[PDB]
Design a protein around this motif. Structure first.
Motif, PDB file in Angstrom:
ATOM      1  N   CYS A 181      29.559  49.603 -29.527  1.00  0.00           N
ATOM      2  CA  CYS A 181      29.511  47.814 -29.465  1.00  0.00           C
ATOM      3  C   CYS A 181      28.148  47.527 -29.537  1.00  0.00           C
ATOM      4  O   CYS A 181      27.689  46.998 -30.603  1.00  0.00           O
ATOM      5  CB  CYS A 181      30.203  47.788 -28.001  1.00  0.00           C
TER       6      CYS A 181
ATOM      7  N   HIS B   3      34.781  49.567 -23.160  1.00  0.00           N
ATOM      8  CA  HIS B   3      34.910  49.241 -24.474  1.00  0.00           C
ATOM      9  C   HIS B   3      33.924  49.910 -25.384  1.00  0.00           C
ATOM     10  O   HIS B   3      34.062  50.056 -26.516  1.00  0.00           O
ATOM     11  CB  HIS B   3      35.266  48.017 -24.863  1.00  0.00           C
TER      12      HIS B   3
ATOM     13  N   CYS C 176      28.909  46.641 -21.006  1.00  0.00           N
ATOM     14  CA  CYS C 176      28.569  45.423 -21.751  1.00  0.00           C
ATOM     15  C   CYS C 176      28.968  44.218 -21.161  1.00  0.00           C
ATOM     16  O   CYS C 176      29.694  44.129 -20.594  1.00  0.00           O
ATOM     17  CB  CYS C 176      29.267  45.670 -23.116  1.00  0.00           C
TER      18      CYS C 176
ATOM     19  N   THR D 111      30.287  41.876 -22.077  1.00  0.00           N
ATOM     20  CA  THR D 111      31.878  41.533 -22.404  1.00  0.00           C
ATOM     21  C   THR D 111      32.602  41.857 -21.191  1.00  0.00           C
ATOM     22  O   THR D 111      33.728  41.239 -20.688  1.00  0.00           O
ATOM     23  CB  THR D 111      32.527  41.952 -23.649  1.00  0.00           C
TER      24      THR D 111
HETATM   25 ZN    ZN Z   1      30.878  44.844 -25.979  1.00  0.00          ZN
END
Ligand code: ZN
Ligand code: NAD
Ligand code: NAD
Ligand code: ZN
Ligand code: ZN
Ligand code: ZN
Lengths: 374, 374
Positions: free
Chosen positions: A174, A67, A46, A48
């Motif tokens: 996510c 995550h 991701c 992130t």
């Molecule tokens: Zn994420």
């Protein structure tokens, strides 16, 4: 005979900023009271995670990131009741302690036990379960899934369908949930409305899906990488445009093609300019803009309050506003019921050890979601 | 005898910035096609009017201000159907042409014929009906009510109850409606919720009224002028606090007395610092902050997008989101039916010629609303 004992496995450690992940041998301490140790099976990449690499998202180092994952529970600590060894689970970036003001609020999901507000890089008890080269390594979002074995808190893990294809459902941890929720929960796209989504990565595309499911009439996709337009159209976009093909600012372009602006706009990139553009493209008198992308740490936006005085609503949300531990298994249940498809989001698959290649793929714009199999 | 002829009367002209109004004789041209000439009866002093004087709100000078008023129609131009000579009416600072994208959207009120977005200082046809010192004088928000007689566009005037007490209902033209509406329509205050209202002027106090009406459990009034606290409490505030009596930032104060933040925050002053503090005081995960107060021209806010990412909604509106020509007569009907009281808002009354005293009263903080009678 791993239960109660320190496990020795491999994980992708980030020792310094703007550097490659180092696959090393780490030591996972056995789960403590109300903690759960999980054997990872699949983990997506991701934006992130990338942000932390670039120093865009601040979090203590050295650390093991990751995550958006899914695995099997190896061992439970004293007092765990929600999951047990052998269970298919999805760790959660935002927990659900169920005992905080927010958790008790049926219309919010940002639990207080989150390690987002003031990143500590530890588990909820304030300590770490990782060691590598005789040095304690930090946790990420309390879940650190860029490891074969990870110890999380009980409220930051949902038990899911035992028949769940972990290589696909990891995205509901996510990516998919964030994008889809942003349109359904947060923005509440209404039937027949006009939407604009900035950013065609895994999360943005999911957001287009959400807009489509919500019944939007027009769904304009915006991205500088035109190679993403095919997937966009496939997932529901009525038209894709590129900021670079135009002389005037993108927002002025969107307003022109929509009689003054869209009803709902989403920014799913993580840049101030595009956040301003997104807000500016929704109609000044009835528009709703939702911030989904995460901007670089400490950079602030400069905005004129008149943009909101006219009649706009500007909002944001994490995980698409879904209460984690509660909605995740429900989304998985929906997937297994053919409610939605995740295949389009997944473009590449690679063994966990080739983690750096996955990030390369992301930087090149060739990939949307790459899955790392352990 | 005045119909179709130019009328010579007195008006409060502002020739320069930061200067007193100059009561001079002006010529009001007869109304043109789809225009209405009104004989003013009462007008209230709103902070917006003060803003123009100080140069905080940009609009063409020389100009005749005033926008929160009530009067009687003297004559109508060709093609007028909604009102006629002798009717009690309230000019509208935001018109309702009923033919634009927004007028047709039942959930928005910022009609395109508004003169706020790009202030021209003229009526809708791009011309003016005022002459003073053989010079063309500009209009304000299309209504210019600081004049014994004014010509406005038909879509910027609402016919009200013939028995309406004009010296009170004038507040429904801007002040009351804006504050009350912000709480009811815009924010949509829910019963049992906790609100925070910055600014105890006539507009802020009306917001408090709206919160009480909406069923808020806690209503925290914030102001630097403690002499306002009595009226605030009378209108519904459960507690009043002054930023100056504390060491820490007002938002840190409110968050501490409300377990992390209010459900609904309102800024009804018009400063960047209070707009940022108001947003900050609402709960990061479920807060909704409404911008009511108009900030100084061209000044921009510096804000971290993360403040919304966590789960906050930020929005704003003009006229409390009320469709002007439509809702104004309804609120008047509500007033006549004792749904609400305006008396508390009205602290001073003066004859039109003493207009500058009204602004003096405002600047001193001894007054909430001052009504000038012609
Ligand atoms: Zn994420
Ligand atoms: N709110 C949340 O909880 C939440 C959850 C997950 C991810 N995110 C964030 O959402 C954002 C997007 O995540 P992603 O996973 O989809 O990553 P991603 O990198 O794969 O997608 C970024 C996309 O934006 C496009 N893009 C980049 N610059 C652009 C520009 N200037 N103009 C137009 N398009 C541009 C890129 O081509 C790519 O298609 C990231 O900031 C990530 O941190 C937020
Ligand atoms: N959105 C709209 O449609 C709309 C409509 C009308 C008025 N307004 C605006 O709303 C605002 C309020 O108008 P008003 O007529 O009620 O003004 P007002 O002057 O009567 O009141 C301002 C109030 O804020 C208080 N205040 C000033 N500085 C403060 C500070 N630093 N901290 C706390 N309190 C402080 C003052 O003591 C006073 O009680 C103005 O900006 C006006 O232009 C907006
Ligand atoms: Zn919680
Ligand atoms: Zn006003
Ligand atoms: Zn209109």
């Amino acid at each position: 005979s791993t239960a109660g004992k320190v496990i020795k496995c491999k994980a992708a450690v980030l020792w310094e900023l703007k550097k490659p992940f180092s696959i090393e041998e780490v030591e996972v301490a056995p789960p403590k009271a109300h903690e759960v140790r999980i054997k990872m099976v699949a983990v997506g990449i991701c934006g992130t995670d990338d942000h932390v690499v670039s120093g865009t998202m601040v979090t203590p180092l050295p650390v093991i990131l990751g995550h958006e994952a899914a695995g099997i529970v190896e061992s439970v600590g004293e007092g765990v009741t929600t999951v047990k060894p052998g269970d298919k689970v999805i760790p959660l970036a935002i927990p659900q302690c169920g005992k905080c003001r927010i958790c008790k609020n049926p219309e919010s999901n940002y639990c207080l036990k989150n390690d987002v507000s003031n990143p500590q890089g530890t588990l909820q008890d304030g300590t770490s379960r990782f060691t590598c080269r005789r040095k304690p390594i930090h946790h990420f979002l309390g879940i650190s899934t860029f490891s074969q074995y990870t110890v999380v808190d009980e409220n930051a893990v949902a038990k899911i369908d035992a028949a769940s294809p972990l290589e696909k459902v990891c995205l509901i941890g996510c990516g998919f949930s964030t994008g889809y929720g942003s349109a359904v929960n947060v923005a509440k796209v209404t039937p027949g409305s006009t939407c604009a989504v900035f950013g065609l990565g895994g999360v943005g595309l999911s957001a287009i899906m959400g807009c489509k499911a919500a019944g939007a009439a027009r769904i304009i996709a915006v991205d500088i990488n035109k190679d993403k337009f095919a997937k966009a159209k496939e997932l529901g976009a009525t038209e894709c445009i590129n900021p670079q093909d135009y002389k005037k600012p993108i927002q002025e372009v969107l307003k022109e093609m929509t009689d003054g602006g869209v009803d709902f706009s989403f920014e799913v990139i993580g840049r101030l300019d595009t956040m301003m553009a997104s807000l500016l493209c929704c109609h000044e008198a009835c528009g709703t803009s939702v911030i989904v992308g995460v901007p670089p740490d400490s950079q602030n936006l400069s905005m004129n309050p008149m943009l909101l005085l006219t009649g706009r609503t500007w909002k944001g949300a994490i995980l698409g506003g879904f209460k984690s531990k509660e909605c995740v298994p429900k989304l998985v249940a929906d997937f297994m019921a053919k409610k939605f498809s995740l295949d389009a989001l997944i473009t590449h698959v690679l063994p966990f050890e080739k983690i750096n290649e996955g990030f390369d793929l992301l930087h090149s714009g060739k990939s949307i979601r790459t899955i790392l199999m352990f």
